[PDB]
Amino acid sequence: GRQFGHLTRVRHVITYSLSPFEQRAFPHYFSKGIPNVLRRTRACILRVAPPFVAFYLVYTWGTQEFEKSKRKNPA
Amino acid sequence: RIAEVDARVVREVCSKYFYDQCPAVAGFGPIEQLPDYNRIRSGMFWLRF
Numbered sequence: 001g002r003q004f005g006h007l008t009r010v011r012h013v014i015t016y017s018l019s020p021f022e023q024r025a026f027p028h029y030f031s032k033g034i035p036n037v038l039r040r041t042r043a044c045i046l047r048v049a050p051p052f053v054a055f056y057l058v059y060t061w062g063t064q065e066f067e068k069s070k071r072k073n074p075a
Numbered sequence: 076r077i078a079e080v081d082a083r084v085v086r087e088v089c090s091k092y093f094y095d096q097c098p099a100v101a102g103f104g105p106i107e108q109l110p111d112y113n114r115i116r117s118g119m120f121w122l123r124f
């Protein structure tokens with residue numbers, strides 16, 4: 001297990017932090033959050049969606065075909 | 076003013092300015108082990124008290 005003070009080397013980097021009792025826990029939750037969700041959805045929709053759309057079409061066709069095959073045809 | 080001070084005065088005066096107050100922290104140098112601000116802030120009270 002590693003420990004702080006032995007992780008890596010860093011130089012010339014300043015970090016400004018504010019106390020949690022000094023700031024909001026939900027700053028602009030909807031006024032800023034909803035735009036960010038839409039940005040992230042657009043960036044990944046084309047990678048995630050087409051596979052499951054392909055599943056949905058194969059699912060419905062296979063179920064429709066299985067239903068029709070079980071119904072008899074006139075001789 | 077100094078003679079007025081006894082142990083009670085120090086406990087009351089210090090709690091007024093230290094206990095459960097938000098500190099200001101300034102760090103410079105090899106400060107990777109400097110505790111996180113939340114951990115510092117949690118150091119300003121005692122769960123036992």
Ligand SMILES: CCCCCC(=O)OC[C@H](COP(=O)([O-])OCCN)OC(=O)CCCCC
Pocket residue numbers: 117118119120121122
């Ligand atoms: C029966 C309860 C025994 C006490 C356990 C407890 O509360 O843990 C301490 C921390 C909060 O104290 P702190 O981290 O501010 O340090 C304060 C030190 N001055 O609480 C947490 O968030 C840890 C999560 C524990 C959940 C099991």
